[PDB]
Each structure stands twice: as structure tokens, then as C-alpha cells.
Design a protein around this ligand. Structure first.
Ligand SMILES: Cc1cc2nc3c(=O)[nH]c(=O)nc-3n(C[C@H](O)[C@H](O)[C@H](O)COP(=O)(O)O)c2cc1C
Ligand SMILES: Cc1cc2nc3c(=O)[nH]c(=O)nc-3n(C[C@H](O)[C@H](O)[C@H](O)COP(=O)(O)O)c2cc1C
Ligand SMILES: COC(=O)c1ccc(CCCCc2c(C(=O)O)[nH]c(=O)[nH]c2=O)cc1
Ligand SMILES: COC(=O)c1ccc(CCCCc2c(C(=O)O)[nH]c(=O)[nH]c2=O)cc1
Ligand SMILES: C[As](C)(=O)[O-]
Ligand SMILES: C[As](C)(=O)[O-]
Lengths: 313, 313
């Protein structure tokens, strides 16, 4: 049994990939992800200029998950574009580039430059609809009229199929609104649910201290903490966006967790915290575990159960 | 060494109490909570009329926490008012009464009738704002205009100090806006952070099914999943509402978890999922555990560390 699959006019050996920001910032990291058994990779979200990001410590992990306030450290867009255009071996697996400009204009400028590389090489865009704190203003995907604007301007500037990285929502009216926004854009062909659960706070009892330096310890949560949140977002968007793909991200440590994401609707399954903690060897384990659950159940393909979570009545 | 607190013109033996909805629906439940070692109790959120709530199964628990869509089952306001007015033994501990009307008028009608019993008997109101208003709109506390309306109307109708049960927020701009709304209302004397993390989805891998019946499996999350979210919300409101008390709720299973809440700013500490799972014996364990951490650290009272979480630099 193999798990190869066909999305966005690309072929994938399996549905696994890193989550943006994990093992993907440097050329070393991208080559390591390309050498792994993952089905695809995605670059660190980028800005027009290089950034050092926030002061350390800015990531910590724990048995139930991680917290981070990285601050968008990256090598800058020119580097990731060069990686895409000149360095990546597309014979090995597909590449996604994540962009997270600090304004709409910065994102439009990056997308106009990516477009011909996308056409020439097939690199795929993941637009990160997360943002820095601006007092008096929520992140873009939490401001639905702002989100509609970004997406209008990117669609126009880019002109090619792309995807969007979403934060979690917690309210069914918000699912309805967000998905309606996304469905106004036919070039949005995948939706990645979810980014980290925003602005949690981990405290060390012995030291009586927060554990990350930025933002008085507040940071985004990943890992075990967030799996039901992630599943809920995957399935909410799966149900609301039938003409799009949904990529699942959040809380995947095992092939069973990936199974759950696929049952909820996921096409690709992205691995953040667990990959950060275990390293790239995780991909062979995930694939073996997923194939074992499939075999036990009699499933021969991912399509047999994608989106097929059962409700009661 | 001492767990006593004196706040809101009451004396509490210790900071622990049930979270609303857990072990508090029936007279039997309320008598059980009263007979426990908890420092206080709160009643099930009520409506004007009795409700059967949602179809079962509607609550499930797992190693990392719980999911529920109970649908507000309760015996109705008159019952809880009678319990406050005639049945509760206030010499044992303080009582809070939670109200969760399905419109602002229903809340007004309840608090006008509660007011005299509050004044005579000293029952304390906790107004649930994580609660539907118009379907297709967000819950009340995710709609800042609705929230302001609810608070203006309840403040006028009730005329006495009360508190509010808040959902978690995930964006700094929402912390800022929410707290600013609360700080418009001087009668809001305590803020309970947090209600369950909304619209999670737990899926059973073996059965391939969601585990609760209502809402196609979507429900609010409690327990280990939500502790860093809870701590963040306690701390954020602690910092932003210096003239109010913050009560902590979410992910408390141990004295250590409680100590973390208290470091974050909690006065009272509410126990939901863990109490549902363990039963009321949990309160003696929590008290002993908290006192053991205080002894190791040399703390003699709760005020010596409440709000004293350290940040880096
Ligand atoms: C250290 C770190 C850095 C991240 N950087 C980014 C980023 O650059 N872009 C992004 O879209 N998400 C970023 N994320 C979010 C992850 O892609 C992912 O959405 C989140 O961690 C949840 O998945 P998990 O439970 O597997 O960790 C980052 C996460 C971590 C832990
Ligand atoms: C079965 C159940 C019923 C609940 N009912 C209510 C309620 O009536 N009113 C309310 O404010 N919160 C209610 N909640 C939320 C809890 O009060 C609490 O905010 C949440 O469970 C998080 O705390 P925990 O992590 O200790 O479970 C309920 C939670 C559970 C599990
Ligand atoms: C808080 O300090 C800041 O300057 C700052 C904080 C956050 C940002 C935006 C981060 C977007 C990239 C990202 C990161 C990250 O780089 O911090 N972490 C995540 O969990 N998800 C993400 O999408 C930009 C600046
Ligand atoms: C989902 O179907 C319904 O009919 C319905 C669902 C929910 C409500 C509001 C519930 C408020 C009480 C409450 C409950 C609850 O009783 O379901 N559960 C929580 O975790 N926190 C709460 O604050 C009212 C009706
Ligand atoms: C593996 As690294 C510090 O470039 O994310
Ligand atoms: C997946 As079967 C063949 O057990 O319904």
C-alpha cells in the first residue's frame, strides 16, 4: 500500500508536510525537509526584508505542546524566492512558499514577484493571514472586511491558485462569515486550518515565571493542547468550502492524529510542534502508523475516508 | 499558613469552588457542593423557564479534558432563587448564582428579582456572557456592542455588585476591547476567566465518529487542553482591570495548577472538568497540594503571590 496523492496539479507521495515556521527557515532547513520522507514542504513565512525576530527565549515545548512568539524571523523574500527559483529539487517533492507581509502592499509586492516563478517552477503560495499586534486592531483573519480586502488585492496581483493559512475560530457565526469570505475568491484553492491558538500563557511553577521573553510570556499554542480546536476548524471549513481543499494542521503527533484530521476533511496534514520536537524522522513514523490504521480498517485510499467523520443521528 | 480570602464583603475558607454547570444543577448537587471542602459554590446557569437541554450524549471526558454541548439544561430561575433565598446555609460558605438568559430582557427580568435576595442574604451574581443572543451572530461576549448593552441593562436593573463569566479571547486587540467594555461598569466587581474554549471537535478514531450528539459534535472544551489559554485570559484581565477581581477557571486539576492561576492574578479558582471527573473529594486534595507548594516556597497567604507572575527582563 502506498499513499501517494494529486492536488493542485501536483503529485504527492503522501499527505505529510512540515507546518510553516518549523524546520524551514534556512537553506539547510529546506534541504533537510526535502531529504525527509515528507510528501511536501513549506518555507518559513517571509517578509520583504530579513528579520531577526524577537528576543530569546521565544519558543518552548512541554509534554502537551508548545508556545512561541518567534516574531517572524526569516531570511527575507529574496532568499525564499531564490530557493524556489534556483535551489529546490522539484523532482523530490512539491514546495509551498509562505508569505506574511506586514501590510497589504508588502504582500502584493511579494506575490507579483512570485507569480512567474509559480508559473515556471510550480511553487505554491500559502498566504499567512496572521499579523503583528497593532493596538486598536485585530489580526487580519479576525477582521473580516480587512481579510476580504487582502484577498481581493492578492488575487488581483497574483492571478494564480493559492492557499491561505487561517487562525482558529471558536464561534459558529465566525465559521460562517470566514468561509463566506473565502468562497468569494475562486483563486483560493486550499485553506490551511490552523495556525497556533493565539496568546496563551505558560507559567513555570518553580520559578514563578513565564517561559518566553516576548509579550510578557504570551504566545501561540501548538501541539496536544490544540488538536480538538484544529479538527473543528478543518471540518467547519471542509463543510463550508466544498470547492476548495482543506489542509489540516494542529496537534499531529501520530498516524492516528493524522487519520482524525483526514476524517475531518484534510487533504494534506501539516506537522509543527511534533516535528520541532522529534525531528524529520517523524515522517516515516507517521506514514507507517497511518498505513497501519488504514490496513486494520480495510481502507486502501485516503479518499475512502476523507471528510467521512460520522455524526450521531 | 493560610488559604483564607475576604472579598466582595464575604469570607472564604479557601479559593476553591465549582465552575458553573458542574455539580450544581439540582438541590442534591448544591447540598453536595455545600457539604464539600470548597470555599464557595456557584449554581448552574439558569434561564427563566426550566430547560431539558440538548440530546445525549452531550458531555464526554478524556485524559486531556472534556467536550460539552449541554444546551443549558436547568431547573429554572425560580428554583435557584428559592435555593438562595430559603435553602442555602450561608454559615457554611458563600453562594454564587449564575444566570444565562437568552436575551437581554430575560436577564433583566431575573436580576430584578434576584436583587432583593442578594441584598438580604448576600448571594452573589455571576452573569454568563458566553451565551447566544441572535442566532447567526456571535455569542454575546464576542459581540462587544451586545456585551455593552447587556451590561448597561443588567447594571441598571440589578443595582448591586456582580461579576461576569467570560469566554476566552485569543487576540490582544480583543483583550483590550473587552476589558475596556468591562471597565465602563463599576458594578462589575469580578471577572471569571474562562468559559470553555468554544466549538472544539473530538473524534473517536476507532468508531470514526464525533463523541457528542448536538451540533454535529462541536462543543466547548475544558480541562488540560485549556490551561494556558485560561492563564492568559486571567493575566490579561488582571492587568487591564485593576479595580476588579479576577476569578480563574480552566484546566485546574492540582494545587499546582491553582497556584499558577493565582500567580496570574486569580482570587477565586473554579474547578470544572476535574471536579466532574473526580468528584467533590477533589477539594481536599487541591487544598493540601496548594498548601504544600506554599510551604516549600515560604508563602503564608495567597496575597503574597497573587498576580506576582514574573516576566523575562
Ligand atoms: C516555532 C514556530 C514557528 C512558526 N512559524 C510560523 C510561520 O512562520 N508561519 C505560519 O503560518 N505558522 C507558523 N507557526 C504555526 C504552525 O505552522 C502551526 O500552525 C502551529 O504550530 C500548529 O500546529 P502544531 O500543533 O503541529 O504545532 C509556527 C509554529 C511554531 C511552533
Ligand atoms: C458539563 C459542563 C457544563 C457547564 N455549564 C456551564 C454553565 O452552566 N455556565 C457557565 O458559565 N459555564 C459552564 N461550563 C463551563 C465551565 O464553568 C468552565 O468555564 C469550563 O468547563 C472550563 O473549566 P475546566 O477546564 O475546569 O472544565 C460548563 C462546563 C461543563 C463541562
Ligand atoms: C510579538 O512580536 C512581534 O514583533 C511580532 C509577532 C508576530 C508577528 C507575526 C508572526 C507570523 C508568523 C508566525 C509565528 C511567528 O513567527 O512568531 N508564529 C506562529 O505560531 N504563527 C505564525 O504565523 C510579527 C511580529
Ligand atoms: C447547542 O444547542 C442549544 O440549544 C444551546 C446551546 C448552548 C446554550 C448556551 C449555554 C450556556 C451554558 C453553558 C454550557 C451549556 O449549558 O451547554 N456549557 C458550557 O461549556 N458553558 C456554558 O456557559 C444555549 C442553547
Ligand atoms: C531548525 As531552525 C533554528 O532554522 O528553525
Ligand atoms: C472500512 As469497513 C470495510 O470496516 O466499513
Amino acid at each position: 500500500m502506498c499513499l501517494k496523492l494529486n492536488l493542485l496539479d501536483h503529485v504527492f507521495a503522501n499527505p505529510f508536510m512540515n507546518a510553516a515556521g518549523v524546520l524551514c527557515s534556512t537553506e539547510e532547513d529546506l534541504r533537510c525537509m526535502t531529504a525527509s520522507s515528507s510528501g511536501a514542504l513549506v518555507s518559513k513565512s517571509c517578509t520583504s526584508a530579513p528579520r531577526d525576530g524577537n528576543p530569546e527565549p521565544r519558543y518552548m515545548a512541554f509534554p502537551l505542546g508548545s508556545i512561541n512568539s518567534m516574531g517572524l524571523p526569516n531570511l527575507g523574500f529574496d532568499f525564499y524566492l531564490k530557493y524556489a527559483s534556483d535551489l529546490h529539487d522539484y523532482s523530490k517533492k512539491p514546495l509551498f512558499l509562505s508569505i506574511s507581509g506586514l501590510s497589504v502592499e508588502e504582500n502584493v509586492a511579494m506575490v507579483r514577484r512570485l507569480a512567474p516563478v509559480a508559473q515556471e517552477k510550480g511553487v505554491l503560495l500559502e498566504l499567512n493571514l496572521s499579523c503583528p499586534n497593532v493596538p486598536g486592531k485585530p489580526q487580519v483573519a479576525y477582521d473580516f472586511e480587512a481579510m476580504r480586502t487582502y484577498l481581493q488585492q492578492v488575487s488581483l496581483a497574483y492571478g494564480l491558485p493559492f492557499g491561505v493559512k487561517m487562525p482558529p475560530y471558536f464561534d459558529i457565526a465566525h465559521f460562517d462569515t470566514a468561509a463566506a469570505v473565502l468562497n468569494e475568491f475562486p483563486l483560493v484553492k486550499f485553506v490551511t486550518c490552523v495556525n497556533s491558538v493565539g496568546n496563551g500563557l505558560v507559567i513555570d511553577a518553580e520559578s514563578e515565571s513565564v517561559v518566553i521573553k516576548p509579550k510578557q510570556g504570551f504566545g501561540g499554542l501548538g501541539g496536544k493542547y490544540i488538536l480538538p480546536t484544529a479538527l473543528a476548524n478543518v471540518n467547519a471549513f471542509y463543510r463550508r468550502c466544498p470547492d476548495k481543499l482543506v489542509f489540516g494542521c494542529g496537534g499531529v503527533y501520530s498516524g492516528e492524529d493524522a487519520f482524525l484530521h483526514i476524517l475531518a476533511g484534510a487533504s494534506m496534514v501539516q506537522v509543527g510542534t511534533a516535528l520541532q520536537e522529534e525531528g524529520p524522522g517523524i515522517f516515516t513514523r507517521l506514514e507507517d502508523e497511518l498505513l497501519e490504521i488504514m490496513a486494520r480498517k480495510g481502507y486502501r485510499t485516503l479518499e475512502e475516508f476523507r471528510g467521512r467523520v460520522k455524526t450521531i443521528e
